[PDB]
Amino acid sequence: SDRVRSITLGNSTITTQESANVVVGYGRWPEYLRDDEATAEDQPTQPDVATCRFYTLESVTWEKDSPGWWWKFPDALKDMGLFGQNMYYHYLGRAGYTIHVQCNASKFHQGCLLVVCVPEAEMGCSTVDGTVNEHGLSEGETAKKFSATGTNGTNTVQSIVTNAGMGVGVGNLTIFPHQWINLRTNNCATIVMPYINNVPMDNMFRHHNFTLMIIPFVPLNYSSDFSTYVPITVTVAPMCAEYNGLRLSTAL
Amino acid sequence: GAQVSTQKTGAHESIIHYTNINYYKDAASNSANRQDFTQDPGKFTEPVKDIMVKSLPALN
Amino acid sequence: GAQVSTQKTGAHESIIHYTNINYYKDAASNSANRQDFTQDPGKFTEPVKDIMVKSLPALN
Amino acid sequence: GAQVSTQKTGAHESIIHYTNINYYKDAASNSANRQDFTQDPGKFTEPVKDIMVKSLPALN
Amino acid sequence: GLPVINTPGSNQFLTSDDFQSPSAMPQFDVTPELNIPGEVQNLMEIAEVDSVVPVNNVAGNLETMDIYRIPVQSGNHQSSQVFGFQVQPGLDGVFKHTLLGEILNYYAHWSGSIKLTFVFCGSAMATGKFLLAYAPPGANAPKSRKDAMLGTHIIWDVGLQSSCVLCIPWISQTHYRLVQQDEYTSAGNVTCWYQTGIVVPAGTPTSCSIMCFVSACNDFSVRLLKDTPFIQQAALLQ
Amino acid sequence: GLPVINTPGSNQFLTSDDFQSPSAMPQFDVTPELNIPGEVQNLMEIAEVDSVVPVNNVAG
Amino acid sequence: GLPVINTPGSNQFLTSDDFQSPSAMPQFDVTPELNIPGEVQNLMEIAEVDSVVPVNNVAGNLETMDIYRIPVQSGNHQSSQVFGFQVQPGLDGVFKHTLLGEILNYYAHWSGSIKLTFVFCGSAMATGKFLLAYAPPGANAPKSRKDAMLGTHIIWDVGLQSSCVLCIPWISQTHYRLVQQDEYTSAGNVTCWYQTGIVVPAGTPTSCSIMCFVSACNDFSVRLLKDTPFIQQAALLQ
Amino acid sequence: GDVVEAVENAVARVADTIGSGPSNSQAVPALTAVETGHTSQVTPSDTVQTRHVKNYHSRSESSIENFLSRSACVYMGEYHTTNSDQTKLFASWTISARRMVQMRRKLEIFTYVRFDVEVTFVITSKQDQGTQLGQDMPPLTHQIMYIPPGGPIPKSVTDYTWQTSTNPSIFWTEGNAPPRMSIPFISIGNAYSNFYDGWSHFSQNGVYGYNTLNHMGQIYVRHVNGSSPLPMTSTVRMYFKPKHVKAWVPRPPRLCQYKNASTVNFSPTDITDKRNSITYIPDTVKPDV
Amino acid sequence: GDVVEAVENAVARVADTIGSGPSNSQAVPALTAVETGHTSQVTPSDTVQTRHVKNYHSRSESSIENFLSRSACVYMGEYHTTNSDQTKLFASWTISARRMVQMRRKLEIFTYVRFDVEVTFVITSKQDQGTQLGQDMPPLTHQIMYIPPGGPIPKSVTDYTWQTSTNPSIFWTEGNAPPRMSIPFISIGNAYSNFYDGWSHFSQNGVYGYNTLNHMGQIYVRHVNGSSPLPMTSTVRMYFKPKHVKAWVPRPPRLCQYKNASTVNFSPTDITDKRNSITYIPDTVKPDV
């Protein structure tokens, strides 16, 4: 079957016995920066295996009423082994990613998750004439939570799922690369995102290249199904990471 | 040193073209490219590796 | 890429033509077809199957 | 008796040129030479007789 | 001096004109183009992408994820119609804020076939067959499965293939319909019925949700640009 | 700048003029022509058709 | 009369237009050209020439030849940093009135590598090694030699070759930076440290000066013409 | 092709409807798996019997160029001929397309865009209301001046700065055609960015969003006659028509109303309009109920 | 090539960054002798390991032609329609680019320059302030007249001198496009001289500097309707756009402000702005101190 699938990057391998397909960016596989597209003149570092491998973030629990979750991206992997170290030491960085969201349940459970990568997901403030916080935006690994109602508070993102923190119709998030995890048919989602930005390279602390959102559209449900615990786990692997402008490490 | 190309067809199923000459030194000064009509829905409606033949199951 | 055609003849029984160039991208912008003079009265004056020779009776 | 030369390239990586005709009797009336791009830093950055190879000492 | 006559139109400013103009920055060296992924070329590329339809746009769901869930369940409910809605892609609440709908609202005319994809989200042990029908205009909405099956329809069998596509072929007296639809450019309705109820084994939820996605087929186009009704302002610093 | 003189008539609006004009709807795709029966081309086609004369146009 | 339509723009006076115009002196015989030495063709020819940087632009030196002297001396001063400054060629006091700086101020965008030449002016019997470092943006200025040597740097050995060149390679997210630099287009800093103190024999001065010259490399260019902030007037007869 | 050229053939025809008959097989085109993230490519002929139709419909008007290439008001302001405020004697703003919504929502459908811009200005003046209204003011001549970031800024209608030895300026007199000019793609980057989920400072603070990326300078406009016995006031309107366009990574159209120019901020708003029930379809076709 | 022609190809590309690896040799490119008066030709690849970069950046906008070729105000003056002073009925100055600084500092970057000039005039009129303001004055028509050195000079708005049988004049009516014309390179010498460290008299006295070399005549401008029941006043602004340029021996840009038009005089001024210490580099990148 084509439900079966394996992926290997560095010293790490992922497997599934129930995959859908694999979505690829806007049809573009990651590539390293070409000479006719570059401006930064110094030799890049391309750690390769030490850096382009699967990092697993802390899992989250899918509850019968979870609104959703999100993660900002280059930031979030900032403490992941050498990928993070290379971030701290360089002014410029560039990478693509293989994102693998995992969630298994049973033939007697039901629910459906939308898994999307939104490039440049600028978010709005709860306090309409106020401004956000970096904290209201991301908490590294972990994950911010969407909300079922309008939120208040200065600095926090106006997170009612319904508008995805961006002021649009959540049900239109599909123009972005994505897959669905429909428990009855599927147990994981895989998206390969290429580097997307309006400049060839960028600083990885100052700019969230894209946001990963996991939003349940049909809620988790089950019966005397002595399994109420249904976790979701995000594993991601940088691809073609290259860095420029080496100097002392950035201030935490 | 001019260019002749065809007009967008109007009210009926040789005199259906126009001529143009650029008078400025910068491409920015030129008129719009209202006649270029390419298309590639694929980037968006079907960005799956592993070609989906759809007349076949899609899973299995 | 221009077109030269003849002018409607005036006050007398080579310099009787004009030249035109289209400057717009849409056929709608062109001038009127004041020079096309076809005709087919038949659709209306004689829409009878069975050709009426009329120099002959028409009945009988 | 006109001249065709290329336009400065704009917003993208044949219709990229323009045509010009001079209508006046004096060169002063012509437009500016915004397209001439020569250069000779040497007159100023390196006006030394005795060529300095600089990868070598420069003195000694 | 070459003889000239100014024609009506001289000196006007037409929003949609298309002329050459002097550059205020002679010889500016523009920054090199960069090959960014995801280049868009025609708004139809966007309309051809599925987006989730808020079918359950009932009072009280307007700001909750329910508006996107069509309720369906175990037990005898055959007489009970599952849902129904008018086919006015740019006008009815069900469609207007959809990816296809938002795009249609920047135009005054549309034409083409539409794809409605329905995806079942119950447990894998759940089972069932539905009848998805589209009725061209001229009569009122079918009021029973008997009446609905006389029109265009698919009978969907829930199985490993979680989704089923009801394609609404373009059937119209005219080549185009107003996006701001009227009765003259009516397009009919689609309704859904249990063809044979939802059966389920013990230990599984007795009710689930069906979602509905819409997108344009490849014979779809739009004409006559206009502003959207959807955005506005009372003052500047916008 | 090419030298020009405006002649009498400049800027007037003559009901029966016949000039090109910019389209306010660049590239509009007009709906396909359909072959309808009864196409008229010259008003004389109508005048060539018999119509009943009210010869007895007397008061009453 | 040839039919014509005037387009928006007709009759305006655009400062940077570029049209033909009648001469008010028909057939004037201009005086013959003479081949004068030193013909300039592109302002970059000027920016490529070294000019002295006023590194020591401290209060009190603004009108004395000191502003051009970087103080360095014999004895133990390793912990003591020799100097440091931001890399904002068109904006920071250290550079703005430089040959390169004055030129950058007539434009809004710049890009390219920069050359910083350092010349030692102590006695010939003086000796020493310095560490010249450039740190791309993203962190605060190195506060010790340890931190500084982690970035781009040369170790300069004073000898018969009185001068040493620290070249600042162009490292940026964007192809261009604002001459009126902001944090978004930050370029980092260069700092200097004793690598191994200044040693000297008896009978010679125990302190001397190091001068610093700046100039553009051959990958340097500027765009978007604008007026300089540096010159002004309150009235005519200027 | 080259997206800088004002000419380029080819009709944008939609697809013909292939004639289709009856079928009994294992082909199951109407059954797909939406989970893959793929949009089904089914056409009418896959699910009903269709006739053949030679379709001539073209998608010309929905090409990105024809969708954006129409002048749109992106700003309007006033300035007086005469006043005690000095400030009110000239207008000035900071270039951006974020202050008028129509244009803004159109651009924001794309994450990045690249293009040249045709700027057209519509300037009008009115005589201010007052007790004495008789005067004979000659035609008003205006000066529009663009100040790239970093240039000296005017401090009064008579500042030396209006000398424009280098800034580009436009002098125009009322009664003539509106002033107009093309501006090239002026970005520091490879494409103008409409959204930026980032900061200005490396320490993840400072200013968030679009603003940190802007900085395209500002515009100043003043009268040149400089006087009028009785007070008058002019309004300057600026229009943008992008041309020679390229766009990347489309996003959903803005759903909630805009709250201000510097942010993407919004209030929670409804997904769509309500209706009576999930089965409600109004009855047309009745002897009128 | 020929610097009189309005067309001429070739891209002004900057240098590519040559890819560079590790080195251990006697090559010592980073060590030069600035005393020679030579500017080092070191590029990044001589001192750090660089990647290869195909650089497309061009120096088009910094070519001398594009730097000077933008109209700049070089003068402005007023004259009245009606007055008792006779003198105030027409304006007059002596041609030079030394009365408005922006233009002047641009030219003064070069010691000698040669070029044709596109002169554009912007004329505006306003009705003077007064108790009675109602009148119906027809359109104002102005006369601009150039008087080469040695020609008879007007003594009133009605002097025979305005007959211009030979001086070149421009008649223009308000409401139309600003008047404009090209003037050829008019010098007695081979290049206009911007500085002259010399005298007018052979005995090393007389007048010092730029002025002795000037003498390009003057401009007179008056109204032609000549009247208006109520007083009005016009302002004439003249703009210079050099074109077909050549420049020699560049010099530093003027640092001190200009004190007057006839001299190079200045007051001592600061080399640049001060900062705290020779090591002061502000701390950006902090959770905002």
Ligand SMILES: NCCCCCCCCCCCC(=O)O
């Ligand atoms: N005198 C006109 C000055 C025009 C400069 C305009 C720059 C416009 C840039 C368009 C920016 C739109 C965007 O941010 O997407």
Ligand SMILES: NCCCCCCCCCCCC(=O)O
């Ligand atoms: N009616 C216009 C008369 C114009 C004569 C202008 C001569 C301008 C010469 C430019 C001199 C600038 C310089 O001394 O460098």
